[PDB]
Design a protein around this ligand. Structure first.
Ligand code: GTP
Ligand code: GTP
Ligand code: MG
Ligand code: MG
Lengths: 175, 32, 32, 173
């Protein structure tokens, strides 16, 4: 009856407009819509994957980046088992703000939560403002895994979610 | 109108209800 | 506390909530 | 599957007991906690009349003014409307005339209407005698009942009577 062996709660955070909802739409529905519809508060989507012969249900919560929803969104940090911190490689402010999103994680998420930084929109390289090297170095400084992704071109979206789920599972299994 | 009318508690309660219903719906949908 | 969210913001969630409730009741009764 | 779908609406001031009236009808339960309705909600109950299965889609409106635009949208499709006041709150009774005007501005001219004077179990705070509710309803040519969601008085009777009156009108096709 239970359609899974593990259930992982994941969370997407980051500035408004960086592509969190599009990343989830690509992962959960394998599609891309360029029409921007800002997220009201929070939403979630589901996808089940297979790791080590186990069924892993991913319950993925998509937060609004806009400040007016901040209190609504931060209530969902405590239960998260893995958190994607998303910025937009064409928006330097969104990258600068990753440091503040990490602070928000430290303040409200579980101490041991798995984290990953995604530099999204890596298909738009002629409007790139954040070098891949700078993204890698920031992630290195915080000891967090890093990937550049594109919801539009479908680059590293499955890789990001599969990798985060494998890191959650390995920690669970070893304990 | 861009006019603020509804509180944090009001929007949060309806969001919570919506999300809980979405879970209930996904559950009974896969009972098929 | 203070009014913060717009009519359209609350309405959008309310109408999504209503739609999911209708969809839920339908799949529920379809288990006859 | 059903024979007919009747859209009903509950309107009236905040706190008069619209949601508890619906809770009694749909769940046969009552709770004293006040959880004010955010905009609108609904419940479904299917009943049997004259060998026809009637699905009642019952929309439960918020009474506070900040939800007025949200709630009035639902008048247009209503086939029956309960106008609810609180027998312990004369202000809610006086506002029935304003709710009637709201119906006249947004609902069909022939919509079935019924007035409920709710909380009739709270006689130690009563502010409106039963006769005043009866006279108000008579003047508009509509039915009246005193109800109690708490004591289970006239809630089933009100909804079945409203549904039967809608069905009788409709059967005169
Ligand atoms: N070129 C390109 N555009 C993208 C990509 N991902 C998202 N976008 C565009 O960026 C805009 C913002 O995307 P969203 O997913 O809605 O952003 P969000 O982070 O969910 O924003 P909030 O919900 O307001 O926090 C959308 O119009 C997308 O079309 C991408 O990978 N490549
Ligand atoms: N004693 C008594 N209390 C009642 C009765 N009906 C409702 N109440 C109480 O009155 C309060 C208001 O009831 P609700 O049904 O929530 O009021 P409402 O009309 O839906 O109010 P809004 O949703 O704000 O428009 C609650 O505390 C109920 O428990 C009743 O028949 N008798
Ligand atoms: Mg979004
Ligand atoms: Mg109510």
């Amino acid at each position: 009856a239970k359609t899974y062996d593990y259930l992982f709660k994941l969370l997407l955070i980051g500035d408004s407009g960086v592509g969190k909802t599009c990343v989830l739409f690509r992962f959960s529905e394998d599609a891309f819509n360029s029409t921007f519809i800002s997220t009201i508060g929070i939403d979630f989507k589901i996808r089940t994957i297979e790791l080590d012969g186990k069924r892993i249900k991913l319950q993925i919560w998509d937060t609004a980046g806009l400040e007016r929803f901040r209190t609504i969104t931060t209530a969902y940090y405590r239960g998260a088992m893995g958190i994607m911190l998303v910025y937009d490689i064409t928006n330097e402010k969104s990258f600068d703000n990753i440091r503040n999103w990490i602070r928000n994680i430290e303040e409200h998420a579980s101490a041991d939560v798995e984290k990953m930084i995604l530099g999204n929109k890596c298909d738009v390289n002629d409007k790139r403002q954040v070098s891949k090297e700078r993204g890698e170095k920031l992630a290195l400084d915080y000891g967090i895994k890093f990937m550049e992704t594109s919801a539009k071109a479908n680059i590293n979206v499955e890789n990001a979610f599969f990798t985060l789920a494998r890191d959650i599972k390995a920690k669970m299994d070893k304990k | 109108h861009n006019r603020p009318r509804f509180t944090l508690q009001e929007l949060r309660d309806v969001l919570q209800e919506r999300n809980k219903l979405k879970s209930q719906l996904l559950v009974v949908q896969e009972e098929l």
